[model samples]
Target: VNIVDYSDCFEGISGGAIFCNTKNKEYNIYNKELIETRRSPCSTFKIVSTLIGLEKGVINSKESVMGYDGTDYPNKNWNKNLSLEEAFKESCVWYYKKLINKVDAKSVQNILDDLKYGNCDISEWEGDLKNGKGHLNGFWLESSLQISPKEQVQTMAKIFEGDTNFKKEHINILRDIMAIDVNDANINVYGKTGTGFDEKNKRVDAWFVGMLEREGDTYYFAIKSDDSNKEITGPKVKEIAINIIKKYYS
Candidate 1:
């Protein structure tokens, strides 16, 4: 179980990880202080959104009905229809926003707090700070709740292995929803797409997170590439994850 701070390795790109359980579990590859600090989760929050929705009966399955247009919600968009699976695959904003609104920002923030996800609560979510409505900096005060790659991987392992009380069934559903299917049956992969504004480079923080499973062994990862275009980032992130998994776990 090792966390390699490869920021310098990535051209000073931000790097924060919890555990990389590779063949060499104990990786003493860096100075430990090399990784960059954590930032907002951006679309990574979708993972929690999916899990919480399923657990709360808000969402049904990968096939749950959702769409763009805002018929019931406030000013939304033209949404035809989408399933939970498609929403995640396509990173549908309205689909997630609707679910979030239904759950209510306050409620969801509290849930996030209880989960000990970030350092702050639902306060800073919508500028309700000081009144307990929003927080200036979560997770680390300077940043929202941050998840090191190592921590992300470990928590995911527990989620996948049914080691936590977070409900494996829902996690499994989330897993299925996040999975991507190529033409080949043997090449199975599940992932989530994330992209958000970054003040550092006037760009967006993009990521492709997922788990790689084969036989009894699996490798879970959260690959975040900063300073990238968030719009068309899904495929590339998924491809990077797939390539990494195949190179090591395969």
Candidate 2:
């Protein structure tokens, strides 16, 4: 297996990344310690939630629409009714929260266990007190659930590489929703971004996890960023991942 350190891509930001080609069983990693340390999965958990929703028949399709409750969110993109695809793209927390709430806790736990995701802990169904609305949400949001970057890549591989028993149709629907437009004809990337904030609303953790297809080979990757003095958001971590991927391919 080939292993290369890409720490320079994360300068000034305390974080790490792991890119793995399951076909070749090769890996490129940066800041191995951080990549192995489990933190809250944050919105990245939506990827699993969406799959569960689809399999449970709660989400019929990528176009399955969910109602908006007018919660006055800070992001305007989240205020309106959104389909599964739109919600995934917008990272609409409310939609996924509502969807997860509709599914039984046992079902969610079973899927998490099957996926071997993070600690597979969802004991805090209502979230944690540290989160303002713990009474109305999921454990994945910087709460009880946590996952390492390396685990994120492993989970992605399991989902996309047919390692899971989830129906192929459901996986295809998720792929359609997770597809990201990189404008590169030779490569196609599918991903999800996650951001977590401290009690003060300061951005503390960010993540980008997904898989890409290039030259008939598929690579799974997970990038995480966290810094005490800097504000790291999902998009920022995604940019860092993209730059690293570009360099690796070049």
Candidate 3:
């Protein structure tokens, strides 16, 4: 396997491509190659998690954005005043991770499957007895879950249209949690950002996916970048993905 390559800097020199739906699924970009590979989906997954939480009442409301209160971990880095809405806006990992752990593995996996997240079964991970944290047999490859732009856009569209195959009340609650401001766009934007360490710990793959408003119609976008500027850790590479999406969509 290719361990690490800064070549995407050149390979995707144009920063990959801008894909926008024109009409009837028509695309705008020309240099096309059927993207057939998967990479990790980072915090951008909050969209899915929020959807699940809202549906289950795990979250009283988007206003309940405080770190899930059960886990014993100290909320050292999170803003003391981070309400549910602002915490996500700040992209606080501790807050989100707390949610993930509180929601527990089974619930999170169900959320993934409910969103039709990917074609994987992440139900239960079997810790390698030898290593204490070995690989379990399922879809999500713990710490290395795979995702793509096309699937991401589709999922976001579901949220935008308010057809979450879930209770309407819960869907709205999810929307509330994901809300974000995008300049003077006259439309609401919501989404999440994620960064993950590659298998070798040499690179980080990033995830950014959400929706935009224009002419009364809302559109969705997803971006995944393999950034080598940092140590491939979650935070550093997560910033890389954010900057990339910002520069492109800005």
Candidate 4:
């Protein structure tokens, strides 16, 4: 349970932990309470959502394509048609939103319950529900749905093991889809990132959670940090996680 304070790593705004499933060792550096507290999974929910999408036959395969309608939202880069892999990498909200319509809330809730994800709450929520549009899947995005950094690692480990009652095809598809980097012959890294705004509309809670695997061992890690300098996006936190992992394996 030795938590390394990563606060200084990104100024005073970062906190969270790196956990190893093999040794049961944890490095919780800062805001331990906050780290245990739940927050929206932001876009990272795509990891599990992808699994559910395939398991439920909502999406036929990793190559299954979802078209993007020409509409503007947050990220303009997401304003194009993309397959599962492309949408995941770009963090396109629209594609998933459409995908969710097929997966539906009830199916998602059932899957989350099966996976024991967070509070298993998918209550319709909006950061500013009164004026802002309510998102059906917003449960993991500044909504009542929340999961701690520790929970994230545990879930990733379970998925990595493919022992969560999901079909082997579904599990294998997820593993294939989540690859961020696999340059090393013996090691493959897979993960997702999440970013959500607080009640104040400020971009805060940032997350990078995933697993790294070799032939015999798989390591799960989650990095959660708040935004102090600027908008804490997924790619930024992902870089930090990669840096930490390289140091760990070194």
Candidate 5:
């Protein structure tokens, strides 16, 4: 059996989930309730968003670039023109909002329907969504788009499997964008990190979801950190995940 441990590494995190998929067994999961409990997908939604945007032909390719709208953005890194890779790496909210605006909501909703993502609720979602107060652009960050760790892993696996029926070109572009390396040439990692608040104003969540390839075997993982303050962020969770990889995957 593959032993997975994060209790020591996850300091200040209220709760979290880690799902490691292997070739033989489906996965070795941690914090089963974390898998069952639903939370906003945060920026990880970009994965599906890119797929739908590409499939609908809204964006021609990941190389496609868009200029910033000139509005003041919270993140200074987002205030310039960006490609899919740059936008994804920076988690540029404006870039995606621009893309989403170009793609009709109906098209997006239809793709979500086909993918059956999360609770499959996009508008005025209940619970955490209701807490969002209807910021359409902030849908994924808010409660409207909820996904559990279990579902997160399943969805990533499906997308990687090509069962979602996305075009090869689209999937390939996504693959190129998601590629990451965990300091081990034996393993190639691709991942995205998300950060946002939960229903309670004090609650914050940090997420990292992606797939890793090793010896022709692929594994998908989701790491989350629930904090009462700002301690949870992309780098924080990513550090934990990489440690886990060093211990388990390497």
Candidate 6:
């Protein structure tokens, strides 16, 4: 239970990183308070949402396509029809919002509660209004739902390590969708990124959570950065996480 502080890895940012060795139950943490502080999970919720969709038979496969609503989006990837994998890679909010809406609230809550996800709160179904209009979004988006970095790492370890009650096939599908193309032959990585924005679209929170496999060992990690700087984003925290991983694995 000793803390391994890697705060230097997050030098300029107000955040924390937690890397856990699933085999031995050892934790490496930075900025203890930040890692324990729960905040809106943002797009990172897609990881769980995808699992729920697959288990509920909502998302049939990686290639299961969902029709776009014809609404133009800043990210062109979100503007067209997309498969589950495509939507995941693009971090398509609309796609997951639609997918989650299809699943019953009780089912979703059950999964989160079982996983012991951060407060497991999903009360804000309609989500926060934007421009004084209901956005029809879910609770995960800077709303009622929140999760700490530690919880995120633990949840990932449970899912990837077969500790959860999720179907093996469904977990495999999620793993495949989350897999990142790393050049290293000995290491495989799977992860998702999330960014929380204010009403004015200012970046307020960022997250990068995932697992890595190497040398017959699996490591689960979560990096979260919350700051007023508009430049602090999901990709930025992802970069920080990557650097930390590289150093840890080196």
Off by over 4 Å in 6: 130-133, 198-203
Please write out the lDDT profile of model 5 over residues 119-193, one tens digit for every residue: 877774222435544333556776677888768887888888788889888898999998886768988888888
Candidate closer to the true structure by lDDT (higher is better), 1 or 5: 5
Off-target runs (Cα >4 Å) in candidate 3 are 1-23, 28-35, 65-81, 102-107, 123-144, 186-188, 231-250
Error of 4 at 135 (Å): 6.2
Error of 4 at 65 (Å): 1.8
Which is superior by TM-score, 1 or 5?
5
- TM-score per candidate: 0.69, 0.92, 0.67, 0.85, 0.88, 0.92
lDDT of 6 by residue, 1-250 (tens): 5576666677688778888996788888887888898888889998898889889888888987766879977888888989999999988888888888888999988999999999999898877766354554668888888899999998998988899998998899899988986666678888988887754445477999999888888889999987778788998888888778777764
Q: Would you list the clashing residue pairs of candidate 4?
A: 3-28, 4-29
How should the candidates be ordered by lDDT, best one leading? Answer: 2, 6, 5, 4, 1, 3
> How high is the CA lDDT of each candidate model?
0.55, 0.84, 0.52, 0.73, 0.75, 0.84
Write the number of the candidate with greater TM-score, choosing between 3 and 5.
Answer: 5
Could you tell me which 10 consecutive residues in candidate 2 have the lowest summed lDDT? 196-205
The sequence of per-residue lDDT tens digits that candidate 3 reaches over residues 1-250 is 1112222323342122223442345333212231224555656666676666666666666678654444333455353646666666665555554555556677766666667666534533331123243321222323435666666776676666765677777666666766666554655566566655455545555555666555555556654555554544444333433443354434
For 13-79, candidate 4 gives per-residue lDDT tens digits of 5656666665445443445776687778888888887888787777877777776667766676676
Q: Model 1: what TM-score? A: 0.69
* Cα RMSD, each candidate: 5.9, 2.2, 6.4, 3.0, 2.9, 2.2
Judge candidate 6 against the unseen true structure and give its global Cα lDDT, from 0 to 1.
Answer: 0.84
Looking at model 4, which ten-residue stretch has the lowest summed lDDT?
A: 125-134
In terms of TM-score, how similar is model 6 to the real structure? 0.92
lDDT (Cα) of model 4: 0.73
Clashes of each: 19, 0, 6, 2, 3, 0
- List of clashing residue pairs for candidate 6: none
